[PDB]
Structure formats: C-alpha cells, structure tokens
Amino acid sequence: NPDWNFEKMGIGGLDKEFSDIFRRAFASRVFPPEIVEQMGCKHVKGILLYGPPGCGKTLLARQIGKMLNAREPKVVNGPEILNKYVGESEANIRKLFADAEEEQRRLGANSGLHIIIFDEIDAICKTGVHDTVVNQLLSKIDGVEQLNNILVIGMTNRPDLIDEALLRPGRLEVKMEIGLPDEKGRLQILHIHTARMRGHQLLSADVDIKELAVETKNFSGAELEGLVRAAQSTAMNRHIKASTKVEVDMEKAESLQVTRGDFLASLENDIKPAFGTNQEDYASYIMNGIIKWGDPVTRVLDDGELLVQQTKNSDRTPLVSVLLEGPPHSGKTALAAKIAEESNFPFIKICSPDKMIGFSETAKCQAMKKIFDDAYKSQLSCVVVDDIERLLDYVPIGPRFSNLVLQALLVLLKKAPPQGRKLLIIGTTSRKDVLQEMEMLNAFSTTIHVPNIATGEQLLEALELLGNFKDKERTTIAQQVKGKKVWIGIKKLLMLIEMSLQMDPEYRVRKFLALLREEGASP
Amino acid sequence: IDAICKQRGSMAGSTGVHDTVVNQLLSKIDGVEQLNNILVIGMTNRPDLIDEALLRPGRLEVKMEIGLPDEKGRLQILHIHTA
Numbered sequence: 266n267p268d269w270n271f272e273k274m275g276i277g278g279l280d281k282e283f284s285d286i287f288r289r290a291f292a293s294r295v296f297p298p299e300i301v302e303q304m305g306c307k308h309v310k311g312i313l314l315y316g317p318p319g320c321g322k323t324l325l326a327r328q329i330g331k332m333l334n335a336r337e338p339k340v341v342n343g344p345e346i347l348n349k350y351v352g353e354s355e356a357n358i359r360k361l362f363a364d365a366e367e368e369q370r371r372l373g374a375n376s377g378l379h380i381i382i383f384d385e386i387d388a389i390c391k392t393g394v395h396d397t398v399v400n401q402l403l404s405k406i407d408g409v410e411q412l413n414n415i416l417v418i419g420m421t422n423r424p425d426l427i428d429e430a431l432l433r434p435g436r437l438e439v440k441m442e443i444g445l446p447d448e449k450g451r452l453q454i455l456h457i458h459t460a461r462m463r464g465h466q467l468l469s470a471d472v473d474i475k476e477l478a479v480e481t482k483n484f485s486g487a488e489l490e491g492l493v494r495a496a497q498s499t500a501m502n503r504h505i506k507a508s509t510k511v512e513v514d515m516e517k518a519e520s521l522q523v524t525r526g527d528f529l530a531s532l533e534n535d536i537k538p539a540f541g542t543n544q545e546d547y548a549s550y551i552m553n554g555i556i557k558w559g560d561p562v563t564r565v566l567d568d569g570e571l572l573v574q575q576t577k578n579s580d581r582t583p584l585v586s587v588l589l590e591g592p593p594h595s596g597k598t599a600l601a602a603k604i605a606e607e608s609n610f611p612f613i614k615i616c617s618p619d620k621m622i623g624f625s626e627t628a629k630c631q632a633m634k635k636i637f638d639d640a641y642k643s644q645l646s647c648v649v650v651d652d653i654e655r656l657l658d659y660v661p662i663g664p665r666f667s668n669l670v671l672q673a674l675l676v677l678l679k680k681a682p683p684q685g686r687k688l689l690i691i692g693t694t695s696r697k698d699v700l701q702e703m704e705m706l707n708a709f710s711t712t713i714h715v716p717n718i719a720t721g722e723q724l725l726e727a728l729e730l731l732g733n734f735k736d737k738e739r740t741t742i743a744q745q746v747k748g749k750k751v752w753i754g755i756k757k758l759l760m761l762i763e764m765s766l767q768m769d770p771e772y773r774v775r776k777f778l779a780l781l782r783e784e785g786a787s788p
Numbered sequence: 789i790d791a792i793c794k795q796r797g798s799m800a801g802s803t804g805v806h807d808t809v810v811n812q813l814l815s816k817i818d819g820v821e822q823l824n825n826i827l828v829i830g831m832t833n834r835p836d837l838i839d840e841a842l843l844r845p846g847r848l849e850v851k852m853e854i855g856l857p858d859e860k861g862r863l864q865i866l867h868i869h870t871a
C-alpha cells in the first residue's frame with residue numbers, strides 16, 4: 266500500500282498532514298479502479314503548497330516524485346512560457362502534455378502517473394497573454410477530455426493573489442502550509458558544513474556546534490553557509506596583513522582554523538538575518554532585580570504560585586484571572602513579570618501601551634484580539650496586561666475614556682479557550698476605585714495587594730540590601746527615622762537616592778533626609 | 789540600475805519590454821550555464837525601486853551604504869581639495 270511514513274520526507278510535522286493524505290485525501294488510487302469507476306469518486310489532481318521561502322517545499326516535491334513509480338516530473342522555473350510572439354506560450358503549455366496524452370490515449374488512465382511541478386505559479390496565473398495562458402491551462406487540466414494520470418503541484422508564498430477559479434474543486438483540491446527551518450534541521454545543516462573541516466583536524470576543539478545552532482534563528486541554508494564563510498574569512502585574515510597596498514598571506518596562511526571567536530564576530534557584525542527573530546526583553550520590565558526587603562514580596566509570590574498551580578491542574582476552571590493592586594510607584598509590573606517567568610509555561614506574552622502610541626480604539630482592539638488569538642493556539646498559556654487605565658485612556662475630567670476597549674476587555678475576561686486548553690490572565694493597575702465604579706472588578710476572579718514601605722526598619726533593611734550608605738550615616742538615619750512611620754515606594758526611593766548622591770559627601774545625608782521629609786505622606 | 793530593473797509588472801503598457809529585460813539579465817547572471825569569471829557592480833540612489841529578486845543570496849547579496857562623512861572625513865576631503 267502507500268504506507269505513508271513522513272519520516273521518509275526527512276522533515277518534521279508532516280506526520281499529521283501525511284496521515285491526512287495517505288488515509289483519506291489520496292486513497293481511491295489504491296482502491297481497485299473498476300469499483301471506483303462503477304460508483305463514482307474522483308481522483309485528486311490538484312495540490313497547492315504555500316509558505317515562506319525555504320528548502321522544504323522543493324525537498325517535499327522531490328520526495329513525492331520518489332514517493333511513486335512515476336515519470337520524471339516536469340518543472341517550469343518562473344514565467345519562461347511568456348514569449349514575444351503570438352501563440353508560442355499556450356503552444357508550449359500544450360507541448361508539456363506530451364507523454365500524458367501519449368499514456369492517456371495508448372493506455373488511457375491505465376498508464377503511469379505524471380507529475381507536474383510549478384514554481385512561482387503566481388507569476389503566470391493571477392492582459393491578453395495572461396488570460397490566454399490561464400484559460401489554456403484550465404482547459405488542459407479540465408476540459409472535454411479528462412486525464413486521470415496527471416498531478417499538478419504548485420508552490421507560492423502569496424496564495425492570496427492566485428486565481429480563484431484555479432481553486433475550484435478538481436483544479437486545486439489539497440491545501441498545504443509550510444513553516445521555517447527548525448532547530449534540528451539547522452543542526453543537520455551545520456554538521457553537513459563543519460564535518461568536512463573536522464576530518465582534517467583543522468577546526469579548534471573549543472567550538473561547540475550546538476551553541477551556534479541555538480543562536481542562529483530564522484537562518485536558511487544559504488544564510489548558514491554565508492555565516493560559515495564569514496567565520497572562515499575572519500579566521501584567514503589573521504594571516505592576511507593586507508593594507509592600503511595589499512601584502513596578503515604569510516608563512517602560516519595555511520592550516521587555518523574556523524575558531525569560535527571568528528564565528529561569533531561574523532554572526533554579530535558581518536552577517537545579518539534577512540527576517541530577524543522574536544524578542545523577550547524581561548530585563549526591560551525587570552531592570553534592577555527583586556530584593557526581599559520584607560514579608561509582602563514572599564506573600565505575593567506564594568499567591569502567584571498557588572494561582573499558577575490551580576490553573577495547571579483544574580478541570581472545570583480552565584480560565585483564571587487575578588488583579589494586582591496598590592499605590593503608584595509600588596513596583597507592580599515587575600512582580601507580575603516575575604510571576605509569569607516563574608510560571609514556566611510554553612507561551613508567555615506581555616501587552617503594554619508602550620507599543621501602541623497614537624493608535625485609535627480600533628487599532629488597540631485589533632492588537633489585543635491578535636494577542637489573545639495567538640494565545641488560544643497553545644495548550645496552556647499566560648498573558649499579562651499592565652496599566653489598564655492607560656489602555657482605556659482615562660482622565661478625571663469629564664471623566665473620559667474609550668468604551669470599545671472596555672467592552673472588549675469585559676468580553677475577553679470570561680471567554681474560555683477551546684476544549685482541553687488552559688489560560689491565565691494577570692492584570693495590573695493602581696486605581697481600584699475607578700475600575701470598581703465601572704463594574705469591572707467583578708470580572709476578575711481574585712485580587713492581590715502590593716504594599717508600600719511603612720516602618721523605618723524596613724527602610725533601613727532596604728538601604729542595607731542596596732549597600733549605598735555606610736554605618737556612620739546609617740546610625741544617624743536610624744536615629745532620626747526609627748521613631749516615626751514612613752510612606753514611600755521603592756522606585757521613588759531609588760530615584761531619591763540617585764538624586765541625593767550627586768552632591769559632595771558633607772551634605773549628602775542632610776540632602777537625602779530633606780528629600781525624605783518633602784516626599785513624606787500617610788495613607 | 790534602477791532605470792532598467794524594476795519590479796515585475798507594476799507597469800501600464802502592452803509591449804511589456806520592462807520584464808523581458810529583467811528576465812534575460814536574471815537568466816544570464818544565474819542560468820543553467822555556470823559562468824564564474826565576472827563581477828557586476830551596481831550603484832543607485834533608491835534601493836527600494838530595485839526588483840526584490842535581484843537582492844538575495846546568489847544574486848548580488850553584498851550591499852553597501854555610503855553615508856555622510858564625519859569630522860575626520862571632512863578634514864581629509866578639505867585637505868585633498870586644497871592641496
């Protein structure tokens with residue numbers, strides 16, 4: 266039988282798609298032809314493969330051409346059919362059907378299978394020349410005479426611009442989607458390149474190919490080869506003392522080694538990716554780390570762990586929400602980012618207003634919808650939304666705000682993901698009364714409170730952990746602040762310390778204390 | 789180079805002479821026959837108008853940006869022109 270493997274194709278994921286085809290898309294072929302003719306059914310003869318540029322599509326087509334006792338596939342590269350003279354292109358299109366018609370007449374459908382490969386079909390299919398070509402191809406594929414031994418495979422990166430009539434059933438039946446070169450493929454390519462040098466013992470042992478493969482992301486085979494060549498260039502130039510004139514070469518220009526340093530230098534400053542990659546700048550939201558100046562941090566973190574484990578191991582509460590609360594400058598987004606990082610989930614993302622400046626309500630709604638749609642594809646995911654009041658931009662005058670964003674958030678806060686999947690949501694804000702007065706506080710399942718430095722001993726402990734002031738100043742600070750309560754956030758404390766450290770040592774303490782007096786307050 | 793090479797299509801004419809030129813150039817630079825004793829240098833003011841196909845691995849694939857000079861460059865240019 267066809268006995269699909271998909272490991273035959275030397276790739277990954279095809280498991281699912283191969284299954285599809287072998288079991289149900291294609292199957293009439295294996296079935297006895299007489300019964301197929303007797304009842305009905307229709308052999309599939311149209312497959313379209315769409316995805317970003319890569320070597321997977323051509324390799325898959327070659328594997329299929331090896332996946333059957335067929336002829337040699339006929340491949341046309343680009344719009345070579347187009348001709349200056351009238352009539353040549355459609356003539357050639359018909360000329361391609363040579364052996365097919367030969368077998369479709371001498372043995373009809375009872376002959377060998379014919380494979381047709383189209384590269385960048387979008388160029389030819391989408392004014393007289395183009396419409397004539399499209400009509401000729403459509404008639405030849407499906408016309409008065411039916412061919413039962415021709416298969417057409419097309420590859421494109423812009424499926425939206427293909428003719429709709431070409432997607433009618435019986436012309437392009439099967440749809441296939443492609444992706445990018447995975448980590449295992451990148452390792453295979455790097456091994457196919459490097460090994461040659463490994464055999465000659467010319468490669469430094471310090472090189473670790475796994476690390477290089479990990480660093481390279483979104484790099485195709487050509488890009489990896491270019492990176493290797495640039496590493497070779499940086500290695501060989503060590504002996505090329507060329508200058509304004511060009512001396513070139515030395516007594517050690519041979520027996521060269523593509524060292525790791527050359528690889529890294531070429532990767533950073535020589536060869537740039539043509540697509541880039543993702544980005545997770547947790548350092549942006551966590552710039553100065555977390556310092557345990559008291560008990561509240563531990564309480565917040567423990568509640569976060571409890572919520573995470575409830576989300577992970579629940580059956581009838583697949584969706585859970587929580588709200589971070591506190592006064593301004595209390596450090597709320599950093600704690601949420603820390604909890605998300607400690608979650609250890611496959612999918613984590615942050616929605617922040619810093620990425621939406623000058624947007625209208627519709628753009629913000631579309632961005633949020635896209636993020637949640639992406640989150641709905643994984644098995645268990647976490648999402649954090651910070652500065653809710655800056656999202657539905659709010660002003661105490663009027664008051665004024667955006668209703669579309671508020672309604673979208675209210676709808677999204679209680680929509681469960683598809684069956685068998687888990688989602689966690691963490692929201693941060695510094696204005697609870699406003700949200701409560703909007704009837705939005707009842708959507709969240711629970712809340713947590715972020716406090717501020719209250720007692721002087723906590724301030725002294727924070728100073729000691731920061732390690733900025735010495736014992737002499739600490740004695741006076743404790744003397745003057747121990748017998749009184751304080752009210753300050755950590756971010757403001759860092760700002761005050763940085764501001765006060767500018768002046769000369771004789772005044773610093775006083776200046777600092779002066780500032781601490783001006784910023785004092787009570788809840 | 790941008791005068792000759794522009795994105796395929798995107799032109800309103802019946803002759804279609806702006807596409808055959810690009811296709812012939814692409815075939816000759818990188819075709820079935822392997823020619824490896826040539827180097828092509830192309831300079832332009834508007835890199836965007838160039839057809840995307842010509843800018844890729846194999847075809848061209850090394851691109852330099854010449855920017856405004858710095859204080860040292862200005863000094864060198866003035867010295868050169870005042871020598």
Ligand SMILES: Nc1ncnc2c1ncn2[C@@H]1O[C@H](COP(=O)(O)OP(=O)(O)OP(=O)(O)O)[C@@H](O)[C@H]1O
Binds near residue numbers: 552555
């Ligand atoms: N124990 C801590 N908890 C939280 N943040 C801390 C802690 N120690 C140091 N930090 C740092 O203090 C800063 C807190 O600022 P953050 O942006 O988290 O506060 P915020 O209340 O969200 O700000 P704002 O109210 O001004 O929008 C961060 O740089 C964070 O890394």
